[PDB]
Design a protein around this nucleic acid. Sequence first.
RNA 1: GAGCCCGGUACGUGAAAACCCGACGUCUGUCUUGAUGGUGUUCCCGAGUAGCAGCGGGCCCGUGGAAUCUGCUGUGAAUCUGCCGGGACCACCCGGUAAGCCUGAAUACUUCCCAGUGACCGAUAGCGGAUUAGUACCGUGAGGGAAUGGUGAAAAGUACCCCGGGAGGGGAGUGAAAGAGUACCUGAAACCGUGCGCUUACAAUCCGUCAGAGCCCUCGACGUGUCGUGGGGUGAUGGCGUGCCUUUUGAAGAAUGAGCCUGCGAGUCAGGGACAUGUCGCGAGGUUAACCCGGGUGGGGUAGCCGCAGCGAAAGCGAGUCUGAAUA
RNA 2: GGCGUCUGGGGGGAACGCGGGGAAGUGAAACAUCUCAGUACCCGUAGGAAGAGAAAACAAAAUGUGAUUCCGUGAGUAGUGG
Lengths: 145, 124, 63, 209
Amino acid sequence: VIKLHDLKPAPGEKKAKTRVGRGEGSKGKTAGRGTKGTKARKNVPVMFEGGQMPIHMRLPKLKGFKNRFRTEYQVVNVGDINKAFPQGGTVGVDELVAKGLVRKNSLVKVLGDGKLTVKVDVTANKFSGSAREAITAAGGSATEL
Amino acid sequence: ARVKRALNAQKKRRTVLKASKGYRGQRSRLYRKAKEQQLHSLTYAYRDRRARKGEFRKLWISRINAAARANDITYNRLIQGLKAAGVEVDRKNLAELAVSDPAAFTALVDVARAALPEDVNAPS
Amino acid sequence: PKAKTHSGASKRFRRTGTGKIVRQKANRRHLLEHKPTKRTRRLDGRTTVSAADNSRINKLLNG
Amino acid sequence: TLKVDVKTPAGKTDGSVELPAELFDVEPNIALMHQVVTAQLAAKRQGTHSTKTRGEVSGGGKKPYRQKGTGRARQGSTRAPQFTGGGTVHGPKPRDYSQRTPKKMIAAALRGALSDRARNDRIHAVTELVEGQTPSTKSAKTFLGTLTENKKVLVVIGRTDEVGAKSVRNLPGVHVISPDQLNTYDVLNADDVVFSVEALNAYISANSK
RNA sequence: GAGCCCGGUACGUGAAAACCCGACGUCUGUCUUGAUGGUGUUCCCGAGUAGCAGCGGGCCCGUGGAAUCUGCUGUGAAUCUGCCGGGACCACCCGGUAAGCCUGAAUACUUCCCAGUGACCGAUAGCGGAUUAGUACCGUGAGGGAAUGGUGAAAAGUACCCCGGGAGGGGAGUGAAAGAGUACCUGAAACCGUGCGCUUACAAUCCGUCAGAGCCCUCGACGUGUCGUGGGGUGAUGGCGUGCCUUUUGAAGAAUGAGCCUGCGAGUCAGGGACAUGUCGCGAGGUUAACCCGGGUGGGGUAGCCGCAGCGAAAGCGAGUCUGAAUA
RNA sequence: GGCGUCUGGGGGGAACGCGGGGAAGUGAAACAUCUCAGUACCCGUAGGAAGAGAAAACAAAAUGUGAUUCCGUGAGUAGUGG
């Protein structure tokens, strides 16, 4: 019978906190800071480099822009379809969502990484060329929304 | 939980103060001065335990030298002769013999003289 | 409070597919007359960040 | 499958309840249960402990005296931590100790505790604790004595079973819980777990469904 | 150290009056001199307003290509095929109807009152303030600002006698205890005495340490004092021996700090923060946030977040992609 | 303007509200743009809460939402910046 006093943490679960400035036995009189200087009292900022022009400022900004109107697709490969639909059949967007191949509320594009040997009808938003050839080769259809 | 420091500190303070009984002045009364003197005392004891063996060997050698010159022989020649004769009595018991049993020391001197070479300065 | 990332580092450094930190090389804005085309070609594109600066750039990017 | 036979306060067996394996036959996990009960006790704890820092203590806004010429130490306030009556440096402040333990961990710890109880047949089912409509501590005490001779028991009855709850309320070793409030700490604190038939069925219906 | 002694607790009960919430009424307003779905045209739809210009404010936006909103100064329209907005602007579509006014709930807070709670403090702590506390005291003033808790179960607080001017004490009593006497629980250290043992007035001492005579005490064994697997105190005498901390290339010190004791006095907390590394759960999935329901620590809650495909400035393509005329 | 007569106001209050005015120490390892910060402080006003509120709104071709307020995300993102 397990009681409240039989519960113990796993081996290696808990580690003692190290308490500094508690005598010369462990970490005394300095807490591991060494002798004086800037770093013995407060800190040094990450972006500081000693007055030399920093690495984050002497290099050029990466080229280009972001295209706020960019359309992104959640991708799924035909190998995933093969591994997840052994019997084939109709394969819509929310079958892929149910199988956990894509996120729930996103545009879906099918790619052609794997091997497709099952007759499968796919309805996605977009297809790659090799994906279309793979789906039609196995006798399936690739209709797009 | 607010913790009072009294018990934990008093423990070591009592230990140090008890160890410093017999010291003169502040060194037996105040914990800080007694602690400094305790550091020095334990350093001294550690050094003196090492030095005590040499001190006692020096005293033994002095006594053996006296008893050997009483038998018309020097300490160094006597040690060489005893080593040559194969006797394995150390300087502690040699001094013990010199003080307590002079006849035994004389006998050992005789065997050491016998074991010595005939010309100690020869290039042997 | 959530950590604030560095703006300049975010504008100057990129991460590749396997997490490599990638930067652009300097000396390619102006004064490109006297520079031979081989020099400007060796300065083109992107390289991975050197090992010495990796920790600092990672710190500046993550937070 | 372990079988629990229902007992009535009249002293006779009524029927049986089948304890499902996935609820009362899981392998107990000591580290998981330890973490869960520790988080439980941390959520229980209220951190109403506070201290005044160097800036919250009264007064001490003016630099006291001459820095130089005095021959004394230089002090910037009468409320500095080294002063008597001054502030506290790193003292307690109010805080919340609750942890965001995942649901699966909590449920698995409860299942492990209940399965440990059921392995050693410390699980009992009764139709009712006492004859209805009037609380009676003597009758409930006698019935619990018949059920078990242990010290601490856990009684799990429905929220509408007011008469039973009042009947077992005053017994020193008895702790009364609702079936939907079952938790690892209360199970592991009890030598025996006496279930009400409706409460047992409600717990099974909530979980095994 | 009380469930059964007391106050109480679970559980029931109780309001003359006042007030606060409801409800039903008198009361008031209001529609019924009314209502519907139809047809083609003139008038109205908030003016020193919108817009524009100059100078500002504030928006992720620091004047920028700067939209929407807004202040002052000029100028100053239209009433529906009118006007405003959709980040300069124009055309087309779409949305709405400025320059009139009211509006509950969801939200913020606690001077004050009531009932509770604490892996909060426990008299140098906790409020400055457990005691005359914003008092004494300091300052012209604004203002600053303390210290001071515990006899005993009950005062039963020592009748009476003696020394003494008293204070104080000694007997005697009270008390379980006066090693509880209103200087009062416990009563540490520094500091100050008294008594006993050993030592010390020819001696250059970081005051100890190692050998160590003598003296004193003590435990065992045998006789009368004499050793022992002994133990403690003090130590004449000999050897060795340059205080601690900090800062330093380097300080026993003639570089720094410390009269002493007792208390107090310095890597902590918050955040689904970031990185790394343990440990636990689940696992191509993992996980909920706000919130809702439970007198709890329990149950629900899919919005999100992170993994699941990358390359490219981007359009885009995709196990590839970018550059490139190029499988170069 | 004067005279008479009625009805109000005035001041206090710990926090919370709304509308105005508005620093510097500090950070930027200097400093003036910038930050600190619309903070501290000040002025005027409330109420038990206040303010906002019934589209001259968003949105993006969806045959879409439908006053305001507050909470979580979106997100330390888009951006902005000697």
